Amino acid sequence: HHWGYGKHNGPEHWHKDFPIAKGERQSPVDIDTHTAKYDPSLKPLSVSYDQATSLRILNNGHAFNVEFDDSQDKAVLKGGPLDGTYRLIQFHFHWGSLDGQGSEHTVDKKKYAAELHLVHWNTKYGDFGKAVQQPDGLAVLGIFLKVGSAKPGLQKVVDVLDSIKTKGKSADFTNFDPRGLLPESLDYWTYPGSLTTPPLLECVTWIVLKEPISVSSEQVLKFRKLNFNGEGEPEELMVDNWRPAQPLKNRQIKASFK
Numbered sequence: 001h002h003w004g005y006g007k008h009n010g011p012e013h014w015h016k017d018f019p020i021a022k023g024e025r026q027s028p029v030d031i032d033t034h035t036a037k038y039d040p041s042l043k044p045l046s047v048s049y050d051q052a053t054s055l056r057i058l059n060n061g062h063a064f065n066v067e068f069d070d071s072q073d074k075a076v077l078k079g080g081p082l083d084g085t086y087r088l089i090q091f092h093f094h095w096g097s098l099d100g101q102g103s104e105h106t107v108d109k110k111k112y113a114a115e116l117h118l119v120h121w122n123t124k125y126g127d128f129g130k131a132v133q134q135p136d137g138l139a140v141l142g143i144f145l146k147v148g149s150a151k152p153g154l155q156k157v158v159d160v161l162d163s164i165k166t167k168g169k170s171a172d173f174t175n176f177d178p179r180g181l182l183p184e185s186l187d188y189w190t191y192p193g194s195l196t197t198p199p200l201l202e203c204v205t206w207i208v209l210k211e212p213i214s215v216s217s218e219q220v221l222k223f224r225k226l227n228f229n230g231e232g233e234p235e236e237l238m239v240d241n242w243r244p245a246q247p248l249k250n251r252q253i254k255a256s257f258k
């Protein structure tokens with residue numbers, strides 16, 4: 001009986017095994033655009049994914065992860081609210097059963113069809129495991145997805161999902177360039193938060209881009225063909241794998257733009 005997104009093991013149940021679920025800096029949160037304040041101390045955001053090396057894609061029973069080789073200083077995120085260099089380790093998405101829902105963060109309560117999370121760990125900590133024991137160990141770049149025109153840079157991901165339909169399946173996935181998933185603008189909101197899935201560790205500096213990327217209905221429909229279950233088990237479509245907005249508590253969301 002482990003965590004998931006169903007009625008009996010979903011978000012409202014996680015606190016039992018992970019008490020920090022009711023913590024002081026949980027994610028995601030609703031981004032009240034009028035309450036967010038422009039911050040002049042933020043440095044320009046720098047996303048350097050030119051040397052990124054993807055290795056494989058995996059269905060972990062919650063979402064699918066595109067993992068990268070982070071043994072060297074390649075794909076890195078720095079600047080903005082970040083001090084130092086954060087290295088890309090993997091990315092995944094959260095999506096809904098319908099286009100009207102799916103994202104984790106919301107903007108003035110508006111839910112997008114999906115949300116992309118590019119996960120990075122602070123290199124000052126040596127590795128991902130050590131980073132998640134720190135208050136500033138991680139940086140997650142979140143990007144909203146809306147349904148409209150297709151996103152060319154996403155098709156390669158969409159086309160390999162058939163090979164990892166069920167929990168536990170993985171497939172080689174080299175030479176994928178994550179630059180093809182970024183919107184034109186890097187304007188963003190930032191705040192201190194947590195991982196949105198158990199263990200819900202509060203080690204994240206969130207950077208959520210204001211501009212969403214457009215993906216086609218056909219592309220997101222394929223996300224919804226994935227399974228939460230493993231091979232040979234009853235089919236439970238992988239949809240609505242998002243956690244709802246959590247209490248902002250003692251936090252301020254800062255904007256990189258005016």
Ligand SMILES: NS(=O)(=O)NCc1csc2ccccc12
Nearest residue numbers: 117119140194195196197198199
């Ligand atoms: N949705 S999320 O990125 O906030 N958390 C998802 C996640 C990324 S790396 C990692 C490692 C262990 C458990 C969960 C996770």
Ligand SMILES: [Zn+2]
Nearest residue numbers: 092094117196
């Ligand atoms: Zn996520």
